[PDB]
Amino acid sequence: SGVAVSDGVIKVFNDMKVRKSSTPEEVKKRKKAVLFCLSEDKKNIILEEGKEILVGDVGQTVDDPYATFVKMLPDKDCRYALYDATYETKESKKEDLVFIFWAPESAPLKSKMIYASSKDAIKKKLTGIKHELQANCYEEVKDRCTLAEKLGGSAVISLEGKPL
Amino acid sequence: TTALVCDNGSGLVKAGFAGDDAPRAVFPSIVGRPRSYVGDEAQSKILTLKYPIEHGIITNWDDMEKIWHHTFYNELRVAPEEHPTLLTEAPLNPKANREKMTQIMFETFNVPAMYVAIQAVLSLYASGYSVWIGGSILASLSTFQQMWITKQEYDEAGPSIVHRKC
Amino acid sequence: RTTGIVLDSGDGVTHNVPIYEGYALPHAIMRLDLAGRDLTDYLMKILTERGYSFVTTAEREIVRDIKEKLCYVALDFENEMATAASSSSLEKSYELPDGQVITIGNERFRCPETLFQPSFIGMESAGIHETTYNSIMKCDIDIRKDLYANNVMSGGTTMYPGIADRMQKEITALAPSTMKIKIIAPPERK
Amino acid sequence: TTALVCDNGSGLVKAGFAGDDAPRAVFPSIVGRPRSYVGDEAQSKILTLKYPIEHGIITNWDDMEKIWHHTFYNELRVAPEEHPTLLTEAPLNPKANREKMTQIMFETFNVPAMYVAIQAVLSLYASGRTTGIVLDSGDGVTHNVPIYEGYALPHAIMRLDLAGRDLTDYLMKILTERGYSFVTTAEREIVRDIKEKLCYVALDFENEMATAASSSSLEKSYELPDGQVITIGNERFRCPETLFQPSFIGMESAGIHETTYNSIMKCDIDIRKDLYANNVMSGGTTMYPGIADRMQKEITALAPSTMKIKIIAPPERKYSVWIGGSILASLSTFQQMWITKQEYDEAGPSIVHRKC
Amino acid sequence: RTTGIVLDSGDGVTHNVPIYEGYALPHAIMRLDLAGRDLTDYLMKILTERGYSFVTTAEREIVRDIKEKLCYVALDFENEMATAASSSSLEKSYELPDGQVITIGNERFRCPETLFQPSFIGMESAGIHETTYNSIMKCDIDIRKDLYANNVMSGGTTMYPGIADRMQKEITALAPSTMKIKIIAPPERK
Amino acid sequence: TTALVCDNGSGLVKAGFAGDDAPRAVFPSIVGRPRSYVGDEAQSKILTLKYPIEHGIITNWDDMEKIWHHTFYNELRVAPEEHPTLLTEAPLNPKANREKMTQIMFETFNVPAMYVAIQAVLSLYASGYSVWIGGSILASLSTFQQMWITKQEYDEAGPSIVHRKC
Ligand SMILES: Nc1ncnc2c1ncn2[C@@H]1O[C@H](COP(=O)(O)OP(=O)(O)O)[C@@H](O)[C@H]1O
Ligand SMILES: Nc1ncnc2c1ncn2[C@@H]1O[C@H](COP(=O)(O)OP(=O)(O)O)[C@@H](O)[C@H]1O
Ligand SMILES: Nc1ncnc2c1ncn2[C@@H]1O[C@H](COP(=O)(O)OP(=O)(O)O)[C@@H](O)[C@H]1O
Ligand SMILES: [Mg+2]
């Protein structure tokens, strides 16, 4: 295991999971999808301010929240993710968050072992999360059908405001 | 502004905001100790599942308030202090269950207002998840917005305001 | 509407309360502990006779989905059994998550019959078609004319194909002939 | 400061320092005695070879102390009492053995801090995965360990006595059919080198044998240490074929392609989908070129047609179990997770069960 | 006799059916797939930790005879483990057909414990001491007094030395104190 | 005169005459094809053993009737045409299994009479191999000798007499 989580990531998770009554001007800077990284010393899980996605921009500059999110993951390193999905089922309309464990084969072993052995140190601190998505290849995470297959299986008819 | 409607059923917990068609949060209402885990994480995982609600009465209270805290924070990611909550129950229900419901909602979460309706009456409203549909179509009504029991009304009345109001 | 008895049957409890033009009758509130979970348990118990053992809780959800998307209630039990006995015209296959396929026969309409014949899982309670009639017969004699023609159904257990027709037939079999029976079956009663 | 990683292999003990790319000390696990030379010395010398780790479980504890003493002094060339040593154990290991290992390590060498990890979870983490069945085909045994989010299911762990040792024995048996008589322990090393350098798993055994019986381009040429050049024909694919057809050796147990399917079908029904597409191979025996394609073909023949089978084979799967432990022990945040001698003095040998 | 629940556990299946004064209760028939074959498999799996590998079917019969004539059920698991941990006072040797001798320790009472703790072979089912209590609790409330004092055991798996005492102790641990528990252990129950 | 009682269990086949204490024929119920052999010869001998009976239902019928012919001829050295046979089964059993049992016993062996009892009821009889003890103590009873289904009763009824009789 080893690596633990910092206070900023826990604060961001508590901010994203539990939303409250907010003003229409502030509600547009909420966090939609944020990744997690390691510092220089590889001892804390820190979010990078560079790569991120806001809730405000979704549907505007970012035509597709998921489509613009696949290319945001670096293919030469291991990364965490937290995607807020809005999928439509035959039964009803749900809005859940997804934990994506990005781990390509092109990354070095030093970045794969650290992120694989410390996954229980981050997932345990993220209380209330259900949808877990472990993705190693890039083609499997690039496809749109896999998210509906993991979320609800064949029941999900539409994903992110558009049908499958 | 919006109101929460929480159909705390015996097998499923349909929880969602008001004014929408479908409940966003649906999961079995069981807690599992390692032989806690609530809902879908319990369904996926070595546990000993058990239902806190029998035939309508809530048998155990710690796991019930745990499920409430779960569906409020880890499932909807909202605080109860802002939006009023709407609870449902079956008729011919022991008054102790409703009293404990009101006490838990007003003391642990400190909601601004709430109400305890009947599942069948709401399922009839939906006729023009039926209970949740009726609760959601009921919470948007303007005439109903006046009969929520509020904390300021609850202080002097104690946990007995629910019988005289609802 | 405000008038009519409600047949609410979810996953753990089935209860009926007749409600008139705003005043409900609490003395006629019937409660039956037979619901979808008991139906799933009965389906698991009767599916072992075909060679498919479901013991664990995780598996039981597969049986739950099988009951949700492959089970129906017959118009009558006897003739549907006669059709089940003769030919496989009734059997239908299912795609399991593991890859295997199963062939269920009379179990498609035998496990939903428990709603009307509780003697399958061992309960002594009258089926959902008799508890409603007994509660209406316990109600007032002037509101029976309005309660007979208004049987509002709700819950996920009332989503079987053909449960409305059987409920109708059973109630007009129990109720007098001159009275007309109506079973409101809304498409969003889940 | 630096941590040691002594992998208790069934036929090769891998030892080195944390942070390196590969183990430094690699020697066969044998304790020679005349009718006590341990490890590499036994092969050079009239002795009866003994294996204390023959089948993945330490059945001869008396020689394990000598094995570890040799590994620490004559192989790693470092003092054990001044460097923490991480150890790996085979799956389905009893609690008594897990306690005896740490008790010996703490009482004989007096190492300040140690840690015991499972080979299966380490090999799975070394492939960038946390959920998936790993194929640990070593020198003495072949284990099929299905793991779920880093927790191996002990009830579905299949153990197979077919491994590289039986493959070397079958190669020695089939090489005498041409005229090459390798009977002694010295020629056994040459047979092992031939198996490592010239053997390969065929995609279709029956079809490959048809071409090998007619074509002459498949025959290779090996150079003996004494200068002789021996030619090997259809024995290149017949030797590793035993892993899929154990009738060649004589055991009734199914091949490594069917034990995997039998172990996957023993776990939960909802996690079988993540096990078919996460089959990881490890051990030195899985280093044959073309074994992943044969495994995928056999599983797709066995598994249902609807679900897909993805077989990933890293090029460093031979020492992946050691590389994983080395990277885990070289962590800058792992120095507080070791089992120091004080905690051992407080809690007895049972501390390893709570800590690990 | 005609009254009492039956604990029938053979080589492949363990099932319990409570039977009153001639009328049995089919709705309380419990079935457990844990039996002697599973115990033999668990013994084979746990005997490899001592250095004895039994892989083939022919050998497995030797393990079956070893379990038949060397295995017993403990009064309680914890104290017997404490005695197993300390000293060899518990170990006993066996004469193999090939001539070798083996020394089994805690395996004499660990593999029969699977009957009460199915989590060893991986099953999620409640042990044989809990399925009987759950079936009696599913039975009628007036026949429980007669079913508690009549637990008829049968089959070859119920022939371990001390299984009757542990079954008793477990049932009076589960059943109320005022009720008296009796475990009929006939000498020809095989 | 004497009656045969055959406890065709899932793991063992206890077969013997009526009126005696112990079953004379006991062997595992498996058939082995060379990689047939039934019972102890299969246990001694390169085969691929498999059980024709799953959890009570008979999966394969050819090997089941083969085991029946074996335990009748090569183990007891008696013909089924003379002594009536008694079969056992578990409750909540598919009717197809009992129908095929009756059809095989009446068509292939042509028994004068037979009966399909319940294993647990017989094991209770033994209380005053328990299933076999109860079957053997049951077959000697005079009152039971009248309710055997006979071939003359079986002809017009077909293989459906067993459900209405037993
Ligand atoms: N399409 C369907 N057909 C038949 N049964 C269904 C269907 N969908 C759901 N069910 C059953 O209904 C149950 C859900 O009941 P529900 O209405 O959610 O109860 P509650 O309102 O108390 O949560 C499930 O257990 C399932 O077995
Ligand atoms: N490149 C290779 N090709 C074929 N076989 C190999 C190769 N490398 C190693 N082996 C075999 O692997 C065996 C060593 O396995 P080992 O690393 O001891 O497994 P474990 O670590 O699980 O005990 C040797 O007997 C050798 O025959
Ligand atoms: N003396 C004994 N002690 C413990 N177990 C025994 C003994 N004798 C037999 N057994 C177990 O009982 C099993 C036999 O079960 P049995 O009663 O024949 O089942 P069935 O009645 O279904 O044939 C054997 O597999 C064996 O493991
Ligand atoms: Mg409901």
Ligand SMILES: [Mg+2]
């Ligand atoms: Mg290894």
Ligand SMILES: [Mg+2]
């Ligand atoms: Mg038996």
